[PDB]
Every structure is written in structure tokens, then in C-alpha cells.
Amino acid sequence: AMRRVEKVIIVEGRSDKQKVAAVLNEPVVIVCTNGTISDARLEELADELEGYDVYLLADADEAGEKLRRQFRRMFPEAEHLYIDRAYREVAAAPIWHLAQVLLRARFDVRIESLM
Ligand SMILES: [Mg+2]
Numbered sequence: 001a002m003r004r005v006e007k008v009i010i011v012e013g014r015s016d017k018q019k020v021a022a023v024l025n026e027p028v029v030i031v032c033t034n035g036t037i038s039d040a041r042l043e044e045l046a047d048e049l050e051g052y053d054v055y056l057l058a059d060a061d062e063a064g065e066k067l068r069r070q071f072r073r074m075f076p077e078a079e080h081l082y083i084d085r086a087y088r089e090v091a092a093a094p095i096w097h098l099a100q101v102l103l104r105a106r107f108d109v110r111i112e113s114l115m
Pocket residue numbers: 059061063064089
């Protein structure tokens with residue numbers, strides 16, 4: 001019946017998480033960093049997610065970029081996903097745009113999220 005969950009999306013904020021969750025049509029673990037995250041916790045997270053298909057979806061702003069920088073150093077296995085700079089933040093991006101970003105990265109998305 002059910003297949004194992006192997007995809008993980010990492011986001012910065014709780015609202016980002018709720019929004020990403022709303023668009024998905026398959027089970028995905030969504031990890032929220034709640035702003036900044038320590039190197040230790042990140043190494044620990046990277047270790048735990050060994051063998052998972054991991055993605056980082058951050059805002060188009062300095063704080064989002066700081067997170068990306070940390071991940072490129074501490075967690076190079078994580079694949080970076082981007083929203084259009086015209087929307088700036090994941091929170092401000094329309095649901096359909098989020099859905100397309102995820103769809104392009106081979107996530108199952110709800111058809112309803114495109115309308
Ligand atoms: Mg931001």
C-alpha cells in the first residue's frame with residue numbers, strides 16, 4: 001500500500017512550512033529552521049537525513065541567502081529551490097507559483113494549487 005517517505009523540504013519559517021505543506025500531494029517531511037540554525041544542529045540534521053532526497057527552499061533576501069550559504073557548507077547534499085525574485089519571500093509567493101517550483105523539482109502537487 002504505502003511507500004516510504006524519502007523527500008524532505010527545509011524552510012526557514014513556520015508560515016513557509018504551512019504553505020508548502022498546503023500544495024503537496026505526497027507525504028514530505030518539512031523541516032523548519034525557525035530562523036537561524038547552528039552548525040552542530042545542521043551537521044546532526046544532515047547525518048539524520050542521509051539517504052533522503054533533501055531540498056532547501058529559502059526566501060530571496062539576505063536571511064534566506066545566509067541559510068543557503070550555511071547549507072552549501074554544512075549540507076551540500078541539499079538541493080536548492082528558488083522562487084521568483086519578484087515575489088521575494090516564500091510567504092508572499094502565490095500558491096500556484098510555489099506549486100510550479102515544486103512540480104519542476106518532481107514533487108507531486110495538488111491540481112487545486114495550480115488554480
Ligand atoms: Mg525573509
